[PDB]
Symmetry: D4
Subunit: 220 residues, 8 copies
């Protein structure tokens, strides 16, 4: 039916805004801003706003790893999962392209390219991105679990704060690229794929491990 | 009936406090405070507090763009929409006037005048203000959507965090003036209208686009 | 009955912790920490935690102005209102006294004494403290209003964020002393009452005005 | 039955992530970062994410003091309480061990070892850790109280913000070690037990006092 | 003879570099950099380097006020004094024009336009600029006094540190525009002459007063 | 003769500028500026500029302790020493009075009143002020020693950097009030003499001890 | 004779230390340190110390551009100029290699690789590096001019402060690479030559232009 | 004769003040102060002031490594070299003991104990301390070289800025302990000798190597 493509657009538009507002706040307007907390809250609130906006439509995955987790969790058709990933990657590039146009080149920089910290190895970078996306996916699956008897608040505020947690930790390590689409968007628009498989392997394994940890070790 | 004017006052008073507390926390008491996160949370929590206060009465729009979005969304009578905008603009000036009286001139400054960043063009400024207000309006419409089956937390905390998101991003670009009333209040009390149409055109288009994106591409 | 004194203790203990954790985080461990956001969130989260703790018992006023507002709002017996204020003031001094013991004198300072900013007059200080406590009381009355049909999140998170809003704004002006008990506690333990009536007149008027604004102009 | 060991793992895994993400964000990547707010939110959001993840399974204590409080509160079998503490301590070391592997030695440091502030005595350190854990446990017991008639938001966001409150205050005093497992993890992996009993005595008394204060002085 | 025009160029080139390096380091590459000390040393070291470079040729006045002081001090022919001022103003605009070309517009800003601080009146601004230039001229006249029996170090390091002193103080008040040429250069290239007479009246009076204070009250 | 009063004015004017520029840069235009280095260099460069200006005339003592040291060192007539102290104190008040007029009240504050740090006792404050002024006087006496065979640079740059050294250390302890005139000027114009004898006893003993240490233990 | 190779070593060793201490202090031990002033003084004081050390031997050029300027200024044999450049480049790599060994990889980074600022074009980068090296060379030639009748202080402190001036300005633009050897050292040891001709063309032209400007337009 | 013991005291007193003012400014009054530049200038200006004070008497070595260098350089009797080292170590402890008394325990800390950076090995720490003291000694030997034909400024300002250079670089690595006496003073008064041989081996080798590099490879 047509609720399929309304979700494909919801993924495309939300991922566009997610990258636009996320990467945009990750742009350094200062040589030293101490911007880790500021940037971490930006991604989290961007996710929280979008989940509140397009959660009922597409689930507001805006993340190939998150879509991969639901694909592993047997809650998404494969075709739709592919369609989300291509829409998220298309949305990510579109958001970063619009961000490129509206942002002066002096502060545009690398468009917040997820890059490994000098002393962080690709293996260490992979493990960190696995844990960054594992807890994040684990938080998503619990919040999106239909059986949620206990009465709590907003699932948007939860998964957003989980994303902020990952950035409060992982930004120093890998730039906190727990979103392959977010990492892809400046990689393509800057022509820089250095250690870019890390931001695909890491989140996908962490999404995969987080999915399996939830629906079999936590709630079969 | 009389629930009309109780809402007109609720808009007037809340917009007064919104500008008073928002602009007040946006006043620089330091040459470098790194105040972006501090100011962004101020507006968001100011909106969240006021939405919790006068949401049931007027909807706590405190924003001509937000009122324009509901006017476009066929949820507001035009006369009442005009009455909200004149009350919000009157409230904005009143709040900034009170802020002027209570704040020493050495820190009063331009009363936090929304001004374009040196390298940001009026077209780039317009687009940013469109996106700042689009997601914000989109978050408002989803939170204020009567059909909200999924059980979440506070709509006040949501739309406030959406406003913080816009300031975390747009303050560097345009001062994050996603509120024509907020931009109008120091423009009139400082006699400075430089690029002030940007803070009317941008938010209104973004409010208009955000409204149309919601009730036809997201939920007809 | 005995639910009276369980609330008197709840006020005493919560105000003790409110001052202890609030004033404690307001103590400067740095010559320049840029601590406004850090201190503002401390008070707000301290209030949010305590409201979650002793809200069902006493209402977690921990504020003579807040108790005065409910006394004006015809929701509190006068005797109990007096009993709350004496307990809050006793709790405030007790919390600041314990804070004095556990904190080294080099960082103890004035025990975070609410003091007027150099250029802020007592009249300007009074008006700011009125508005700081008006919105705060207004947010409390709306959150504590039994008729709260619209389904939202936590009232603790709301009134706490309202308190953070007041500190994000008023700390520069008056130290954000929207709590007479909080202002009283270091005033007595430092032997400094300079402009201390401001932190009683301001909040009480703001609490009074906020109460009247709610139950007659907002919801008769 | 088997819901026992699913909770033992939930405690082990969540405490692993709690230490991993908590201690990891507490690692200084800067000589002066002014990281108190950043680190305080990290622990709180880490707790909030994990409580949302494994709250329904084990209660997400991830804290020997918190388990001790429920043991005192007659809501936990002793054997299970021991099993939680050994799992939390095992999880804490495992999380800090993984953090050690993924973090470069130049920023690894003491692995965020809870250490007394220069002027803070062991008695003052103990009292602070008692109050840090008292309010935290008090907030947990109220949020986890089955009788919670008043409709509020998320218990995860509450207890997480309570943890942030303790770090906003106690980090200057003792590093805010209101978790014996969190304090144990770098103590064992750095071979440093200086004043380490403080981080066991303090939280346990504060957990004990917080438990007794709740279910007899606040709600028998 | 031809040592005249070699000095006219020395004034032109040094004032070009003085504005180029001075204004360039005064450009804000950060929203809060706490750049006062950094900018103050930039002007001072720029003056010290240029005085070391072209001091023996023209005296390295690079300042219409400084030339005016020597004109008042009966050590400069009037024609040459005019020729220095036109060369300094031409050099200032040339330096700021080159700075405009090499600097991205996002950080170009107002080209470090000397602007009155919000609470500083034109009379207060004038007095500050008088004192900023008085001590600076007084330091120049003493260092350039042929009778300097006492054996000291570099006159370049002295007058440069005097300029840094003026910026350490006057930047907060008026931007420390103790150089009419330096103030003129961005005023003309930004089309902004707001309170620009202050940066001519102030320094000239301060240069005049500083000259008279030296050669009649200090050393007739 | 008349070289006496030319020195009395030189002391009066230089102490006026010393307080004006010193106290002025010590005024906090930010809640946290991390201004210790900035303020320390301000006093030092202010002293260096003035020593270069009026050193040959009066010696540029601009300090009652420094005059007292030369009085003890048998290099100053007592009457002239009194005349310097009254001129320095008159100059100090005049400089702080002019600073009061030109500075907005919001940043005027206590006019940089030398105040004991919270944990610093009057005895500890006295000892620190003794050492701050001892080395400073010792540096002055060596630089002003006629027998200075070894060829070095500027005595102004030396004694100024000695003053910066004292402020880099003593500002945290006592505000680095190694000048009774500098401490007197805001004490009289703010009506605050709290622990003000410390800033007279300390520097005078340190000046006295520094004088005796030089001309008998270092160079009889 | 043998004073040739003593100078070749002096160039080699001083350039080794110049890169070692310069690049070492340019290494970011913080995500935001606001290190521009700190790094700028490091290079300048490193140059000042080395000029004081090996100035009498080789002239302490430690800069291929500086050697090129003297080669253009007809004060250096070509063979010796080549020998200085190869020694400086060998010293630069040796210094950066030792710095690599002693510095942990987490803070080693790109070894302070001179890289163009995002919005700075190669032409703008070239012009800035020309001016950075022009004034620096101009300051060197004046300080090293045998005819220096006027009695001033240290030539080491002068040329060092000139280098600090260039870094206070050029670090934002190009990293202030006014030394081809300094730019070469991390370029070779990181395998990154992006826009590396800029740091050769710019300084050499600026050194060439600075040399010609001095000995023909300033002092034939 | 008696000029021996006047120098022994000069070493004792100057090293006392050197440690007192150096370690005192190295005490952290803030969790993040970004104090590297502030502390680096403190040591350098402390050395510069003392060299100006007691340079003509003892040479103002205030450093066992510096005394060892002159002992190696055949410019000091061995007995006197021992007498300097015991006086410097006695002075260092005395200065740190006085600093202990006058400084509150909350900011006293480890008394600025030279401690290896987490990722810095003892071998890397040794090499850095060798280079920190090599250039410093090399700068001392050149400045103190009787044959100093070229006319420059102050040797005190030179060796002080060399010390600042070492702290601008080495503070991150080892705390910049290029003075065994400075490292010894808090090691003994805190009962902590962890990696304390590094601060003896490193500086002594660097002093030894710096001495030999000067008087045989630079000036036989
Ligand atoms: C749907 C239709 C929307 C129409 C919107 C029209 C906007 C046109 C914007 C054109 C902007 C151009 C500028 O950014 C800028 C001028 O260049 P300069 O900086 O003056 O020089 C060049 C130098 N260099 C080195 C890059 C070659 N152009 C660029 O460089 C990059 C342009 C990036 C365009 C990104 C297009 C994003 C498309 C978003 C599609 C959203 C679809 C939504 C469907 C419902
Ligand atoms: C409803 C009745 C409320 C009554 C409240 C009475 C307050 C009176 C406040 C008067 C304040 C004056 C000061 O701020 C200040 C003294 O001036 P100076 O700084 O000494 O010098 C001057 C220099 N210059 C250059 C500006 C000419 N005045 C000003 O400059 C600006 C005054 C701004 C007044 C703003 C009035 C806001 C009205 C808010 C209405 C709220 C209505 C609510 C209805 C339910
Ligand atoms: C209920 C029973 C609780 C028992 C708890 C026993 C704690 C004893 C603490 C005694 C602490 C002493 C230290 O702080 C300290 C040592 O002094 P120094 O710093 O070494 O020198 C002195 C210098 N000067 C200038 C101040 C004179 N004393 C002080 O100065 C200030 C002490 C402040 C005591 C505050 C008592 C708070 C009572 C809280 C009551 C809570 C009741 C709860 C009922 C359920
Ligand atoms: C379950 C199976 C998981 C398999 C994962 C395999 C990961 C192997 C990681 C090995 C890592 C080694 C590096 O960190 C590092 C290389 O050393 P260097 O820095 O090159 O030199 C050495 C110098 N010094 C002084 C320390 C001797 N090793 C270390 O030093 C410390 C290693 C710490 C290992 C921590 C193991 C955590 C186990 C987590 C278990 C989770 C179980 C989950 C069950 C479901
Ligand atoms: C002597 C001969 C020297 C020749 C040097 C040739 C350099 C040519 C530089 C041309 C540079 C152009 C760019 O900056 C830039 C491109 O523009 P955009 O940013 O792409 O767009 C435009 C937008 N808008 C709104 C401004 C219209 N142009 C500008 O906007 C401003 C140019 C400023 C030129 C300043 C010339 C300084 C002359 C210095 C003279 C020194 C003489 C020394 C004699 C010995
Ligand atoms: C020459 C004669 C000079 C006489 C000067 C007299 C000064 C007496 C100072 C006594 C100071 C005591 C305080 O610091 C302080 C009180 O203690 P609390 O903090 O209240 O408690 C204790 C707790 N605890 C854990 C440490 C046991 N005492 C200390 O702890 C440490 C004292 C350190 C004394 C350092 C003496 C330096 C001697 C310098 C000699 C200079 C000689 C010059 C010859 C020409």
């Amino acid at each position: 039916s047509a609720s399929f493509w309304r979700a494909i657009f919801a993924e495309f538009f939300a991922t566009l805004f997610y990258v636009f507002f996320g990467l945009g706040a990750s742009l350094r307007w200062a040589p030293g801003p101490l911007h880790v907390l500021q940037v971490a809250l930006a991604f989290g609130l961007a996710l929280a706003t979008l989940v509140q906006a397009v959660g009922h439509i597409s689930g507001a995955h805006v993340n190939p790893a998150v879509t991969f987790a639901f694909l592993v969790g047997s809650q998404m058709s494969l075709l739709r999962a592919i369609c989300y990933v291509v829409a998220q990657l298309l949305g990510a590039v579109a958001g970063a392209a619009v961000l490129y146009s509206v942002t002066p080149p002096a502060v545009r920089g690398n468009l917040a390219l997820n890059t490994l910290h000098p002393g962080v190895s690709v293996g260490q970078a992979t493990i960190v991105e696995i844990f960054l996306t594992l807890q994040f996916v684990l938080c998503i699956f619990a919040t999106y679990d239909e059986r949620r008897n206990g009465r709590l608040g907003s699932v948007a505020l939860a998964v957003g704060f989980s994303l902020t947690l990952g950035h409060l930790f992982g930004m120093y390590y890998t730039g906190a690229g727990m979103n392959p689409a977010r990492s892809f968007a400046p990689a393509i628009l800057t022509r820089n794929f250095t250690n870019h498989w890390v931001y695909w392997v890491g989140p996908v394994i962490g999404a995969g491990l987080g999915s399996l940890l939830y629906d079999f070790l936590l709630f079969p």
